[PDB]
Design a protein around this motif. Structure first.
Motif, PDB file in Angstrom:
ATOM      1  N   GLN E  24       0.495  -1.107  -0.240  1.00 42.85           N
ATOM      2  CA  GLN E  24      -0.106   0.517  -0.492  1.00 42.85           C
ATOM      3  C   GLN E  24       0.681   1.488  -0.401  1.00 42.85           C
ATOM      4  N   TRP E  27       2.229   2.063  -3.175  1.00 45.38           N
ATOM      5  CA  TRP E  27       1.277   3.004  -4.243  1.00 45.38           C
ATOM      6  C   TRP E  27       0.806   4.401  -4.060  1.00 45.38           C
ATOM      7  N   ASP E  28       0.858   4.092  -2.685  1.00 49.42           N
ATOM      8  CA  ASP E  28       0.648   6.233  -1.774  1.00 49.42           C
ATOM      9  C   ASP E  28       2.095   6.942  -2.024  1.00 49.42           C
ATOM     10  N   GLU E  30       3.724   6.172  -4.590  1.00 50.09           N
ATOM     11  CA  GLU E  30       4.096   7.168  -6.106  1.00 50.09           C
ATOM     12  C   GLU E  30       2.998   7.587  -6.499  1.00 50.09           C
ATOM     13  N   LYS E  31       1.781   7.865  -5.964  1.00 52.13           N
ATOM     14  CA  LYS E  31       0.707   8.163  -6.102  1.00 52.13           C
ATOM     15  C   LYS E  31       1.106  10.208  -5.735  1.00 52.13           C
ATOM     16  N   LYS E  34       3.785  11.002  -8.507  1.00 55.91           N
ATOM     17  CA  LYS E  34       3.484  11.636  -9.403  1.00 55.91           C
ATOM     18  C   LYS E  34       1.786  12.100  -8.912  1.00 55.91           C
ATOM     19  N   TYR E  36      -1.550  12.403  -8.843  1.00 56.45           N
ATOM     20  CA  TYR E  36      -2.252  11.626  -8.949  1.00 56.45           C
ATOM     21  C   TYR E  36      -3.782  11.855  -8.405  1.00 56.45           C
ATOM     22  N   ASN E  37      -4.736  12.365  -8.652  1.00 53.56           N
ATOM     23  CA  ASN E  37      -6.208  12.875  -7.795  1.00 53.56           C
ATOM     24  C   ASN E  37      -6.665  12.109  -8.810  1.00 53.56           C
ATOM     25  N   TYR E  38      -7.880  12.398  -8.406  1.00 47.55           N
ATOM     26  CA  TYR E  38      -9.699  11.862  -8.857  1.00 47.55           C
ATOM     27  C   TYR E  38     -11.130  13.826  -8.700  1.00 47.55           C
ATOM     28  N   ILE E  39     -11.837  13.700  -8.934  1.00 44.53           N
ATOM     29  CA  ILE E  39     -12.292  14.659  -9.130  1.00 44.53           C
ATOM     30  C   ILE E  39     -13.661  14.076  -8.304  1.00 44.53           C
ATOM     31  N   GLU E  40     -13.091  14.615  -7.052  1.00 45.98           N
ATOM     32  CA  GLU E  40     -13.890  13.895  -5.577  1.00 45.98           C
ATOM     33  C   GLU E  40     -15.888  14.739  -5.972  1.00 45.98           C
ATOM     34  N   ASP E  41     -17.033  14.605  -5.559  1.00 47.40           N
ATOM     35  CA  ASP E  41     -18.391  14.311  -5.666  1.00 47.40           C
ATOM     36  C   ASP E  41     -18.198  15.882  -5.043  1.00 47.40           C
ATOM     37  N   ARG E  42     -19.580  16.278  -4.448  1.00 47.43           N
ATOM     38  CA  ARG E  42     -19.993  17.141  -3.957  1.00 47.43           C
ATOM     39  C   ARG E  42     -20.554  16.768  -2.939  1.00 47.43           C
TER      40      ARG E  42
END
Ligand SMILES: CCCCCCCCCCCCCCCCCC(=O)OC[C@H](COP(=O)([O-])OCC(O)COP(=O)([O-])OC[C@@H](COC(=O)CCCCCCCCCCCCCCCCC)OC(=O)CCCCCCCCCCCCCCCCC)OC(=O)CCCCCCCCCCCCCCCCC
Ligand SMILES: CCCCCCCCCCCCCCCCCC(=O)OC[C@H](COP(=O)([O-])OCC(O)COP(=O)([O-])OC[C@@H](COC(=O)CCCCCCCCCCCCCCCCC)OC(=O)CCCCCCCCCCCCCCCCC)OC(=O)CCCCCCCCCCCCCCCCC
Ligand SMILES: CCCCCCCCCCCCCCCCCC(=O)OC[C@H](COP(=O)([O-])OCC(O)COP(=O)([O-])OC[C@@H](COC(=O)CCCCCCCCCCCCCCCCC)OC(=O)CCCCCCCCCCCCCCCCC)OC(=O)CCCCCCCCCCCCCCCCC
Ligand SMILES: CCCCCCCC/C=C/CCCCCCCC(=O)OC[C@H](COP(=O)(O)OCCN)OC(=O)CCCCCCC/C=C/CCCCCCCC
Ligand SMILES: CCCCCCCCCCCCO[C@@H]1O[C@H](CO)[C@@H](O[C@H]2O[C@H](CO)[C@@H](O)[C@H](O)[C@H]2O)[C@H](O)[C@H]1O
Lengths: 63, 97, 104, 108, 59, 51, 94, 110, 69, 60, 60
Positions: E24, E27-28, E30-31, E34, E36-42
């Motif tokens: 784990q 990956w934490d 590496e991200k 580099k 790496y993120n994501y669009i969080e929802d409302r």
């Protein structure tokens, strides 16, 4: 809340587009750097290329 | 990467030692892939399974025959009356009547 | 008999998984991979002044990835190799002439 | 002697445990909006997912998607035949042999 | 400590948890290196179960 | 709506027939969609079995 | 069956009611997806993130297994491939 | 041409999000030439193709790496794939229902 | 629910991973052996298939293992 | 063997060579006071300090 | 092993030496017509004519 949601839907659509294209541009950047490195490395190859039949380093007898 | 014969979880699968097998499947795979869910299985319908909804089934109906009854019944008080003595409520709420 | 069979099986397995050792005796290699490996085994890994600093960083990262996959922590040459590549990372924004004195 | 086994444990319902099923439950049936949503997206030309594209940009090494009869069901498969490397000398180790018993530097 | 030289299967049974945690952390890292993120929802309508409850903010 | 319904189904038996036909059509279309989703789910289960 | 008050006419009426109900469902979902959805975008982003994560873990596991196999190159002895009273072959990486 | 097409596309993007432009640029910028190309066809669907001289670098039986567009949804294709998987698995026990809720309906619930 | 709506990249601990693989194994066995039941998979049903002449014997005694003293 | 999901549980491991099948028994019901709680005295509850008695002497 | 009152029933007999554990399977569902009913053809239903494959070659 409905007005806010309509605006947010439009914004999120645009943002998804931008995020995809940004990630792909980053990918392309890295690949272009790799290509530059390879172009420099191919200059170190000897004239006529490598003798792929034999071992590069012969590290012992064969009697 | 230090104790290979003692760490079998991080080792290749026995199909890898066998030297025999459009796009082909990979030749080398680890046993550490067992620690991931979507390693081999696909991620299809991953975020759409919590969206299959079913409604409840309770019916709030009960006949109310009052002709059978002739006496009153007790009833609970659910909240304190703030419409009266509003200013004093924090000061008398702790007492018992 | 047993040793012959075992060692032929190992050879076939390594050929199957496309391995390369100190004796570079693999024909399926890329020429770039072969140059990199022969630098790590026989020659001197060094970044060229022709390259841009980003590409130098990329080259050093490739060297480090390759060498760390090749040499495990039990290997004796791992620490010297990692130290040399760390010195290259320290001295990316320099010429080979100035880098030699520090990384020698 | 594993298939077609006998009932080994009893089946029962404890007193007054609830069931949560009404009398029309057999006529009830499930439904997902996913098929309708897909049709509507295709008809209105809404943003598609990247899973419709077989190439995979999510890593540096080349991956190609393999689809199982539908764009919703895919797995990425790597294309490279990866070269592996060993900074190791050959013939320097005989693990079957007990080395604590032999006299020499290797034994010590 | 579990003597994996003589009981490797028994010791791996004890140590694979730390191997998983290392997996784990890899990956934490590496991200984080580099980005790496994501669009969080409302925020959800019932993010709080009760109005008087505190909504402790998490990164 | 009540006018349009009684114009075409003035009697109780016809109203019941129309209601039952409506129910059957709804159920049939739902079954079509459910069959499609079931095929997808079946494929995923088969891939789990293959794993 | 087409016009007159009859059992076929009532059956046709019910079928039309069902199809109009499903047309209404189509309209509901169309308007929702066109103006009242961010979940799709958020989930798509999260799934792309998941793909990156998956491929990272895959490559890492492959590297570890490759290192396990590389630990056998020390055990490999190419002289054992030699046949008695014959010369050694450079095929087995002298 | 590849760089210019990519720059033009990314500002007025396609539903593909310019993936073919991206891969085309990536494969053009290689020194020795493109390894992966897009086959030119009279056939409706285009295919991804791999050059022969670099086939030994890739884990493939042939040069055809499949279509460049995803499949179209079809009941028949889904049926075909499911039947093929069932045949390959060969599991006696699939579809067996040891208990079914007793009802006039054949499939209670679903 | 943990990955896509709460933001956890590592939703499953070792226990949950074991549970997932246990259920996968049970699915495999249920589809492989027709009619398999409790002692091998958590499952019980009444309408079972029996040979017709069902013999009933005593189990053998538990195997004597060697022990010190 | 240790697991309950093994049929030969609490049975000695089988080897190509002949080996005594009397097993090491871990301490399952230890006394309350275990005055020495060092590793030296703790390891004896799960392994034998001198190793197992299943080693071979190969004729060849 | 043969008896149902044995725990290792239908399992190969264990010997001090290493031996292939694939067992001889008697004919439990023979065909109706067994044209040769001589001892030569009958013995193959319960024993192998060449003997079992469990024999040792002792190093000493
Ligand atoms: C001592 C304490 C006093 C203080 C009180 C303190 C309490 C205060 C708080 C209040 C209590 C709250 C407690 C917490 C609640 C949570 C627990 C809970 O709800 O679930 C538990 C419990 C758990 O069940 P479950 O296993 O979990 O399943 C849950 C399901 O979701 C639900 O289960 P289900 O859906 O499977 O069961 C429903 C059931 C019953 O469903 C219904 O009945 C629906 C309601 C209709 C009622 C109106 C119709 C009345 C008709 C009367 C006419 C009869 C003829 C007249 C004869 C006269 C002579 C006697 O269905 C059937 O049995 C089949 C009937 C199908 C047809 C019905 C529809 C057609 C209706 C018209 C009839 C036509 C028939 C034609 C036949 C066809 C011919 C062609 O839920 C139930 O069982 C629900 C049914 C319970 C019924 C109780 C029976 C007693 C009812 C009387 C109550 C007292 C009356 C008071 C006086 C008023 C009446 C005079
Ligand atoms: C024995 C008696 C005889 C019985 C006879 C029965 C046979 C006759 C036919 C009647 C059959 C009953 C049908 C019931 C509905 C379908 C079944 C059902 O409920 O499934 C659940 C299902 C649940 O959907 P889901 O997405 O899975 O989950 C829902 C959650 O809430 C999702 O969670 P969320 O977080 O995403 O929340 C989203 C939510 C968010 O919603 C909101 O935020 C607020 C909602 C609006 C509040 C009002 C705000 C004001 C702005 C709107 C303005 C509306 C008024 C107009 C004002 C004009 C001035 C501007 O969105 C909605 O849920 C909107 C729902 C749609 C409401 C608008 C549709 C029109 C309403 C009037 C229909 C009346 C039918 C009468 C039938 C006759 C019965 C005797 O329902 C739906 O699919 C949505 C309904 C879509 C419309 C279907 C209409 C066609 C089907 C019915 C045929 C008859 C219609 C004839 C047209 C009449 C002219 C209007
Ligand atoms: C004396 C009181 C009156 C007695 C009569 C009450 C019962 C009337 C109904 C009779 C007809 C039943 C059908 C029989 C045909 C065979 C089918 C069948 O058996 O399955 C049903 C069920 C077995 O279920 P199954 O094995 O799973 O079979 C498949 C499913 O059932 C079916 O497949 P599915 O699962 O797919 O179907 C699901 C869905 C499909 O159906 C539906 O969804 C809709 C159904 C509801 C229709 C609603 C009415 C329609 C209204 C339209 C008009 C509306 C407008 C006008 C009206 C406005 C309202 C005012 O819902 C249902 O099917 C529900 C079925 C309801 C079962 C009956 C519930 C009542 C239980 C007995 C109550 C006893 C009361 C106390 C007696 C006291 C006497 C001392 O068996 C029974 O219900 C047994 C009924 C036995 C009657 C007993 C009568 C008492 C006699 C005394 C004997 C003494 C010994 C008794 C012990 C204790 C004594 C102290
Ligand atoms: C199997 C063949 C059936 C042939 C028809 C015979 C009549 C059977 C009728 C049984 C159901 C009648 C209920 C009438 C209301 C139906 C309304 C309806 O269908 O709306 C759907 C709605 C569910 O919608 P969702 O699943 O959440 O999402 C849908 C989005 N696509 O349906 C329901 O909720 C059904 C359950 C509620 C109705 C239950 C009412 C109590 C039942 C008593 C009446 C039954 C009478 C019929 C028996 C026959 C003799 C009269
Ligand atoms: C035949 C006639 C048909 C008429 C059709 C009527 C269409 C009605 C569509 C309304 C759908 C609105 O859907 C609902 O709206 C609210 C805001 O308004 C959204 O937004 C709400 O939830 C999300 C997160 O969960 C966030 O935006 C926020 O927490 C909250 O505002 C919901 O995510 C959405 O589920």
């Amino acid at each position: 809340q409905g007005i806010k949601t309509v605006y947010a839907s439009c914004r999120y659509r645009k943002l998804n587009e931008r995020e995809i294209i940004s990630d792909r541009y980053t990918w392309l950047h890295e690949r272009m750097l790799e290509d530059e490195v390879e172009r420099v490395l191919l200059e170190q190859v000897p004239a006529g290329g490598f003798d792929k039949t034999r071992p590069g380093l012969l590290l012992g007898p064969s009697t | 990467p230090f104790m290979w014969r003692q760490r079998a979880y991080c080792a290749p699968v026995p199909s890898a030692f066998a030297s025999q097998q459009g796009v082909r499947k990979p030749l080398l795979r680890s046993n550490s892939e067992s620690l991931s869910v979507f390693s081999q299985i696909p991620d299809g319908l991953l975020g759409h399974t919590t969206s299959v909804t079913m409604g409840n089934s309770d019916i709030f109906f009960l006949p109310k025959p009052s002709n059978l009854l002739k006496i009153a019944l007790p009833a609970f008080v659910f909240m304190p009356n703030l419409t009266i003595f509003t200013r004093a409520f924090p000061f008398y709420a702790h007492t018992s009547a | 008999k047993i040793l012959r069979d075992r060692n032929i099986g190992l050879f076939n397995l390594l050929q199957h998984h496309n391995f390369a050792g100190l004796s570079v005796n693999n024909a399926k290699l890329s020429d770039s991979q072969r140059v990199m490996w022969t630098d790590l085994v026989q020659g001197k890994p060094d970044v060229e002044d022709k390259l841009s600093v980003d590409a130098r960083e990329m080259k050093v990262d490739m060297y480090e990835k390759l060498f760390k996959q090749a040499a495990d922590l039990e290997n004796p040459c791992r620490m010297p190799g990692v130290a040399y590549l760390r010195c290259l990372r320290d001295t990316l924004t320099e010429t080979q002439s100035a880098r030699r004195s520090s990384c020698l | 002697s594993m298939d077609h086994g006998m009932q080994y444990s009893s089946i029962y319902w404890e007193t007054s445990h609830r069931t949560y099923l009404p009398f029309w439950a057999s006529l009830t049936q499930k439904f997902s909006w996913k098929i309708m949503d897909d049709q509507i997206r295709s008809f209105l030309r809404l943003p598609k997912p990247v899973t419709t594209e077989p190439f995979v940009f999510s890593s540096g090494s080349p991956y190609i998607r393999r689809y199982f009869g539908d764009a919703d069901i895919s797995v990425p498969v790597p294309l490279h035949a990866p070269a592996h490397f060993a900074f190791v000398p050959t013939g320097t180790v005989s693990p079957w042999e007990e080395t604590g018993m032999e006299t020499g530097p290797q034994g010590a | 400590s579990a003597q994996a030289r003589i009981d490797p299967q028994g010791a791996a049974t004890k140590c694979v948890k730390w191997f998983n945690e290392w997996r784990q952390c890899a990956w934490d890292q590496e991200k984080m290196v580099k980005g790496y993120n994501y669009i969080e929802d409302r925020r959800a309508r019932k993010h709080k179960p009760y109005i008087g409850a505190p909504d402790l903010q998490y990164s | 709506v009540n006018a349009f319904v009684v114009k075409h189904n003035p009697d109780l038996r016809l109203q019941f027939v129309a209601f039952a036909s409506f129910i059957a059509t709804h159920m049939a279309i739902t079954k079509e969609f459910n069959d499609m989703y079931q095929r997808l789910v079946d494929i995923t289960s088969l891939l789990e079995l293959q794993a | 069956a087409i016009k007159g008050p009859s059992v076929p006419h009532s059956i046709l009426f019910g079928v039309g009611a069902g199809c109009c109900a499903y047309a209404g469902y189509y309209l509901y979902r169309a308007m929702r997806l066109t103006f009242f959805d961010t979940e799709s975008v958020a989930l798509q982003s999260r799934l792309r993130y998941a793909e990156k994560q998956k491929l990272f873990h895959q490559e890492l596991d492959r590297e570890l297994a490759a290192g396990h196999i590389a630990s056998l190159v020390a055990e490999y002895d190419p002289v054992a491939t030699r046949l008695p009273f014959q010369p050694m072959q450079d095929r087995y990486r002298v | 041409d590849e760089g210019i097409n990519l720059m033009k596309c990314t500002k007025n993007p396609d539903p593909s999000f310019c993936a073919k432009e991206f891969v085309a640029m990536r494969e053009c910028n290689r020194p020795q030439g493109p390894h992966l190309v897009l086959s030119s066809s009279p056939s409706s669907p285009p295919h991804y193709e791999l050059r022969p001289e670099v086939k030994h670098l890739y884990n493939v039986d042939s040069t055809d790496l499949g279509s460049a567009v995803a499949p179209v949804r079809s009941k028949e294709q889904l049926d075909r794939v499911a039947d093929s998987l069932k045949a390959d698995l060969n599991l006696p026990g699939y579809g067996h229902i040891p208990y079914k809720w007793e009802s006039l309906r054949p499939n209670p619930g679903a | 629910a943990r990955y896509c709506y709460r933001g956890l990249d590592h939703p499953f601990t070792l226990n949950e991973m074991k549970d997932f693989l246990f259920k996968l194994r049970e699915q495999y066995l249920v589809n492989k052996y027709e009619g398999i039941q409790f002692p091998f998979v958590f499952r019980q049903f009444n309408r079972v298939s029996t040979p017709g002449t069902l013999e009933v014997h005593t189990s053998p005694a538990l195997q004597q293992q060697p022990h010190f003293h | 063997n240790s697991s309950i999901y093994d049929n030969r549980n609490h049975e000695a491991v089988r080897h190509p060579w002949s080996t005594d099948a009397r097993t090491f028994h871990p301490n399952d019901n230890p006394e309350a006071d275990r005055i020495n709680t060092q590793y030296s005295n703790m390891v004896s509850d799960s392994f034998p300090e001198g190793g197992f008695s299943d080693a071979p002497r190969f004729s060849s």
